[PDB]
């Protein structure tokens, strides 16, 4: 039974959140880094925190981690959100129009349009899942 507790885990998350650039991959390097940056009164707790820091860095190298706020991953998230794609799928030359939608558009102001394509209605009214 080798399971870390919350006093190890939350403190290690704060250490990685505040000092992500100083920490690395090697255990015997970031162990001494966590010793120098954090006041840990015992070697056993220091080794637990350093091991959980190494395991979270392995999780970072494998992919994204939920309970963390890294500035570089936040910048990458902001870049992927602010990425602008090519021309839209809303701007099409052929837009499939159902006949009742064509009727209500005729009853509205814009009845006859330029780049619409009216389609045939789905014959056969079978749309419900059978019971049981």
């Amino acid at each position: 039974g080798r399971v870390r507790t919350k006093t190890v885990k939350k403190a290690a998350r704060v250490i990685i959140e505040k000092y992500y650039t100083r920490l690395g991959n090697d255990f015997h390097t970031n162990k001494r880094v966590c010793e120098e940056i954090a006041i840990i009164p015992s070697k056993k707790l220091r080794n637990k925190i350093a091991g959980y820091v190494t395991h979270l860095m392995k999780r970072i190298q494998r992919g994204p981690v939920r309970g963390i706020s890294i500035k570089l991953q936040e910048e990458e998230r902001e870049r992927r959100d602010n990425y602008v794609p090519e021309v839209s799928a809303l701007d099409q030359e052929i837009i499939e129009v159902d006949p009742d939608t064509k009727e209500m558009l005729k009853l509205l102001d814009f009845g006859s349009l330029s780049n619409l394509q009216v389609t045939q209605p789905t014959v056969g009214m079978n749309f419900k899942t059978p019971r049981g």
Binding site: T7, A11, V14, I15, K18, Y19, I37, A38, I39, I40, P41, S42, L45, I49
Partner: protein, 57 residues
């Protein structure tokens, strides 16, 4: 753990007081708590984007 002698009987008094921690050691102990993990704040530094020098003498 103290006693008090009343007229009817004798009552016991248990007073347990947890002392806070200080770095000096006057009001409390010198060694900190094992559960408390002290993490300092990183200094607000600005990353340089232009190679400059600080030559003197």
């Amino acid at each position: 753990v103290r006693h008090v002698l009343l007229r009817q009987g004798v009552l016991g008094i248990k007073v347990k007081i947890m002392l806070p921690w200080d770095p000096s050691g006057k009001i409390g102990p010198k060694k900190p708590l094992p559960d408390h993990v002290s993490i300092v704040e990183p200094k607000d530094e600005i990353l340089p984007t232009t190679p400059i020098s600080e030559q003197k003498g």
